[PDB]
Amino acid sequence: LATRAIPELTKLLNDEDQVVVNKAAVMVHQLSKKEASRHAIMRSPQMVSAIVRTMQNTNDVETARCTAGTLHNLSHHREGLLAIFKSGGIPALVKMLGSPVDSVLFYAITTLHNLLLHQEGAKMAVRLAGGLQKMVALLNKTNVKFLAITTDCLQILAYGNQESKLIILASGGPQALVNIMRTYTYEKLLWTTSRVLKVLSVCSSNKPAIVEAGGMQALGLHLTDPSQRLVQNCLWTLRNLSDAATKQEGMEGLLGTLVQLLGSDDINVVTCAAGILSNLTCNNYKNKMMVCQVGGIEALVRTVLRAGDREDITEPAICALRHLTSRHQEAEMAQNAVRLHYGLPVVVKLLHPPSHWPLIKATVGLIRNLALCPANHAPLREQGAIPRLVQLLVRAHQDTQQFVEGVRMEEIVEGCTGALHILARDVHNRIVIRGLNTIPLFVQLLYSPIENIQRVAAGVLCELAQDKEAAEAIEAEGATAPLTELLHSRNEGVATYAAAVLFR
Amino acid sequence: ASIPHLILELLKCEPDEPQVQAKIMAYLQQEQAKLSTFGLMCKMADQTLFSIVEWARSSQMKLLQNCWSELLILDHIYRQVVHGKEGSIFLVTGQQVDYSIIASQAGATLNNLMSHAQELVAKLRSLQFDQREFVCLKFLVLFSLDVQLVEGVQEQVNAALLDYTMCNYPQQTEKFGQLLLRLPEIRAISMQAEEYLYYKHLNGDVPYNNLLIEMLHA
Numbered sequence: 227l228a229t230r231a232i233p234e235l236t237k238l239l240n241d242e243d244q245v246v247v248n249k250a251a252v253m254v255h256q257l258s259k260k261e262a263s264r265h266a267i268m269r270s271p272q273m274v275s276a277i278v279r280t281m282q283n284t285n286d287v288e289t290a291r292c293t294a295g296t297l298h299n300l301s302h303h304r305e306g307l308l309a310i311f312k313s314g315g316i317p318a319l320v321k322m323l324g325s326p327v328d329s330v331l332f333y334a335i336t337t338l339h340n341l342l343l344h345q346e347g348a349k350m351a352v353r354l355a356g357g358l359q360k361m362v363a364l365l366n367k368t369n370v371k372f373l374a375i376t377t378d379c380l381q382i383l384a385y386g387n388q389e390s391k392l393i394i395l396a397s398g399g400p401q402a403l404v405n406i407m408r409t410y411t412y413e414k415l416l417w418t419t420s421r422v423l424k425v426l427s428v429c430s431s432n433k434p435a436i437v438e439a440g441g442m443q444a445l446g447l448h449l450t451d452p453s454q455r456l457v458q459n460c461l462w463t464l465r466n467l468s469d470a471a472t473k474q475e476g477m478e479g480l481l482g483t484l485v486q487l488l489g490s491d492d493i494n495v496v497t498c499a500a501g502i503l504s505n506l507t508c509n510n511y512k513n514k515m516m517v518c519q520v521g522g523i524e525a526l527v528r529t530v531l532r533a534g535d536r537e538d539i540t541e542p543a544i545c546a547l548r549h550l551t552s553r554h555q556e557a558e559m560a561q562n563a564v565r566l567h568y569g570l571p572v573v574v575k576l577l578h579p580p581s582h583w584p585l586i587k588a589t590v591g592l593i594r595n596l597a598l599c600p601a602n603h604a605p606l607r608e609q610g611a612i613p614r615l616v617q618l619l620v621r622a623h624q625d626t627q628q629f630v631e632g633v634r635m636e637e638i639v640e641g642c643t644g645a646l647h648i649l650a651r652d653v654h655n656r657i658v659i660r661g662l663n664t665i666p667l668f669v670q671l672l673y674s675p676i677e678n679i680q681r682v683a684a685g686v687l688c689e690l691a692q693d694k695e696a697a698e699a700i701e702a703e704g705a706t707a708p709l710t711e712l713l714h715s716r717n718e719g720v721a722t723y724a725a726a727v728l729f730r
Numbered sequence: 731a732s733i734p735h736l737i738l739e740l741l742k743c744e745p746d747e748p749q750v751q752a753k754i755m756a757y758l759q760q761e762q763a764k765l766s767t768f769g770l771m772c773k774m775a776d777q778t779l780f781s782i783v784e785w786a787r788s789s790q791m792k793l794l795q796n797c798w799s800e801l802l803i804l805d806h807i808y809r810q811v812v813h814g815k816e817g818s819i820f821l822v823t824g825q826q827v828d829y830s831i832i833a834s835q836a837g838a839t840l841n842n843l844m845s846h847a848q849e850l851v852a853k854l855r856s857l858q859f860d861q862r863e864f865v866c867l868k869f870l871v872l873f874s875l876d877v878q879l880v881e882g883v884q885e886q887v888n889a890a891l892l893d894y895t896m897c898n899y900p901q902q903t904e905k906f907g908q909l910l911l912r913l914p915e916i917r918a919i920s921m922q923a924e925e926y927l928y929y930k931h932l933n934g935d936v937p938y939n940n941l942l943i944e945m946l947h948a
């Protein structure tokens with residue numbers, strides 16, 4: 227039967243009396259509501275093509291609601307999607323996204339949603355019709371269910387596609403997305419909205435804009451939510467955005483929540499918490515201050531202890547501790563709280579195998595900071611820091627004759643020589659450092675091409691040279707030749723230290 | 731779906747495993763119709779490398795001359811990650827050489843190369859290394875930044891791989907970075923594999939004709 231009905235309405239959908247074509251349309255929308263007829267339509271190119279073209283260029287709300295509704299119904303079948311696709315309905319649907327009337331928007335977006343999901347070529351198609359701009363613009367609507375489908379569409383278009391991302395960025399996507407996270411409590415919506423942000427946060431143009439739109443503070447509100455899937459998009463996103471956030475204010479709550487999550491039963495929540503904290507405390511003194519204040523140092527040491535040999539955890543955690551123990555008002559209390567909270571021995575333990583270079587680099591940098599506090603000078607020696615630090619130094623120096631596990635061995639030379647430079651502020655430490663027969667190396671290191679290696683080498687010989695026999699030992703090693711040639715060096719540090727050694 | 735569009739393209743450029751595995755065995759079969767086990771393996775590797783250059787019909791000799799060995803290693807490693815049983819080893823032909831045999835016949839150098847490939851296979855099975863990431867690494871290995879459209883394909887495949895693993899392995903905060911760190915391990919094993927084979931060549935152990943040495947010498 228239906229096969230005879232169709233060719234009829236097809237002809238009426240092309241008539242010139244908008245009342246005819248309008249009645250043709252109200253007709254067909256009803257037919258698509260039934261299994262059999264609907265199948266007849268999507269098997270009829272002429273008809274489908276006719277429905278799209280009517281929905282495109284029309285100006286009757288009613289015919290718009292019925293053509294859009296019709297495509298919605300065909301869009302539930304694989305061959306329906308295929309008909310809408312071949313028939314050029316994607317551009318018309320993207321036009322319907324301009325509609326004021328809320329029944330049309332619903333139909334257009336859902337149809338577009340099924341297309342994006344199950345129909346190959348639809349993504350490219352929807353982009354070429356300027357669908358992204360339209361979808362971002364619809365983000366100021368207030369039907370949260372509607373907003374759920376829209377953000378889901380953006381996510382599908384955004385995924386693994388840097389081009390589309392940059393497009394969403396340019397339409398104001400970040401601010402609109404962040405505003406959703408600040409406004410609604412619908413888990414499904416917040417979940418879909420956080421995937422878009424997740425996907426967008428890996429793009430280096432999008433990352434700053436999201437941060438700028440107060441994205442981190444907004445994601446911060448959702449970290450305690452019951453929904454594990456929502457909470458994991460937020461941690462993913464926060465982690466991606468956090469290398470680019472030294473600017474922000476209003477961060478007190480987020481940092482606070484971050485410290486608490488350090489105690490999570492969930493090894494992954496814990497891992498991301500450390501990473502974000504590491505990231506937010508890096509070269510940002512106000513964050514160092516706030517994290518220290520809610521017991522961050524205590525929480526981070528507990529975390530390193532709990533993780534044992536799990537470097538996915540200790541490495542971000544050590545990194546944060548390294549940030550927290552330098553260059554801020556409370557840096558000193560923190561170098562102490564690390565010891566006070568039974569952190570020294572474990573920090574030094576991490577220098578040994580099975581630890582890999584990334585952890586080792588981080589730990590070396592933390593030990594250098596801990597040493598700035600004289601009350602750690604003795605504890606760090608008792609634990610065996612120095613022999614290990616020297617062992618790593620000679621091992622990385624010899625290996626300079628590219629990126630081993632992500633780490634340049636020339637970073638292990640520098641970091642090790644620097645940790646010793648600070649440790650050497652204590653005479654007992656200086657006796658030990660000399661003992662290990664280090665002087666010839668420090669002198670060899672003076673010829674290193676890297677300015678920063680010269681600096682730390684010249685720095686440790688300088689701390690050693692405050693002792694007569696040491697000062698002479700250094701002379702006897704051919705130090706006075708390279709040392710002098712360093713007096714005329716670009717950066718002050720190498721110059722001043724070189725002078726201080728010569729001085730003796 | 732759940733797979734970026736680029737990764738879907740690359741997956742469409744993959745060869746038919748069960749087809750090229752019979753073609754290769756049916757080639758070595760008629761080859762003994764002598765030469766040593768090492769000579770069989772040289773011939774096999776030779777053939778595998780032919781499949782690999784064929785496969786490289788997708789999105790030339792300056793590149794192939796960079797990674798031919800890295801590609802051959804990466805192929806071998808992925809076979810062990812997928813089909814690998816414990817204690818043995820699977821070749822592109824299907825054979826299952828036990829490590830008992832490897833340690834019994836083969837010498838020190840080759841046993842070390844095997845040990846390194848097993849540290850890698852372990853690592854990748856632990857990461858849950860899958861086909862989609864596999865093909866991504868191929869292209870990242872082929873399209874080296876160490877030899878125009880390269881930076882291009884590198885940026886793009888990076889982007890897609892990063893999204894793919896973030897979304898498909900959420901519980902592994904660190905996966906993307908971990909995979910990328912296998913690339914310099916593969917190169918290091920490929921450098922030791924070239925040197926070992928170079929010495930076999932200087933000693934007449936390599937068959938009169940083989941693609942590997944041609945590539946090595948260029």
Ligand SMILES: CCCCCCCCC/C=C\CCCCC(=O)O[C@@H](COC(=O)CCCCCC/C=C/CCCCCCCCC)COP(=O)(O)OC[C@H](O)CO
Binds near residue numbers: 775803837844
């Ligand atoms: C898995 C890592 C690769 C190892 C070999 C690398 C470079 C060589 C490439 C071409 C040929 C492969 C050589 C494999 C060993 C060889 O075929 O047969 C060996 C014995 O056979 C058995 O152990 C049993 C059979 C064992 C089969 C080996 C399985 C792996 C083969 C494919 C791997 C990928 C292709 C390599 C690409 C690299 C570039 C050339 C002979 O050992 P020997 O040379 O005397 O050691 C002496 C020593 O190292 C003297 O001191």
